[PDB]
């Protein structure tokens, strides 16, 4: 008696939009779970929003998605990653929280919006997004929330 869409998500810090409970009610007569827009996140850490029509049937989200501090991995081992556009290997908007510059000499982080603007931290995140093949979207300094768009994982 597992989830009717076959979706595996046991980790209590994670959540989905639509919720796992809604997804249980979003299965068609052939067992397929198909949604328009899908978010998976982890409280305190970040979230990944997939626009468009997404087929979630039998996704082991526990195996596939890992949202850690300042890092997301979607498919750990490469052989489990489907072709571009399938499963979760597709365009998405990544939000990572608590992304703040470290003072490696004072070993503490700079988190005030005043200082983040004084040091133009936002432009570092813009360059880092481009460097990694992504498109910078936003930075919310209070929460250190770095948002950027990716074409694949």
């Amino acid at each position, epitope marked *: 008696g597992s989830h009717p869409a076959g979706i595996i998500l046991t980790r209590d810090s994670y959540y989905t939009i639509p919720s796992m409970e809604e997804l249980a009610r979003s299965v068609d007569e052939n067992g397929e779970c198909i949604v328009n827009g899908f978010t998976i996140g982890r409280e305190g850490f970040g979230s990944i929003y997939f626009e468009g029509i997404v087929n979630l049937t039998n996704l082991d989200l526990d195996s596939i998605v890992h949202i850690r501090r300042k890092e*997301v991995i*979607v498919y750990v081992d490469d*052989q489990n990653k489907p*072709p571009l556009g399938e499963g979760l290997n597709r365009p998405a908007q*990544v939000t990572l929280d608590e992304v703040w510059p470290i003072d490696k000499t004072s070993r503490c982080m700079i988190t005030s919006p005043e200082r983040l603007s004084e040091m133009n931290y936002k432009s570092k995140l813009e360059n880092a997004s481009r*460097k*990694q*093949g992504a498109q910078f979207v936003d930075y919310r300094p209070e929460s250190g929330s770095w948002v950027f768009k990716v074409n694949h994982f």
Partner: nanobody
Amino acid sequence: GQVQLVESGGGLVQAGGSLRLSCAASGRTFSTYAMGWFRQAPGKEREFVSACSWSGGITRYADSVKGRFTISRDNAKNTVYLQMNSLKPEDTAVYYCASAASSAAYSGAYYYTSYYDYWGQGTQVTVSS
């Protein structure tokens, strides 16, 4: 130039055979967040081949080499390897090893040449028919 990479092990191999490339990393090697292999064939652009995180726990391969190539690294020796199996003439290229000194915010970062900061000089692989 705070990390230096020197590849070795290139050579001529018959189609279907195997070849293992090596790369020796020097300098501030604990800087590295990722190691990768790229290749450039004559007249074409430099293209992604393979990558792993520093830990070796996450791996990425080009579709063309999935299941034939295996990247690995030895952090006792500060060496990086590319095991190349079932080689084809389309695998003929100069192979470069590269290292990234910043973390991958998302697991697709590994595919991009811009993500890597230090580069070896390359070693030549030639696969005969």
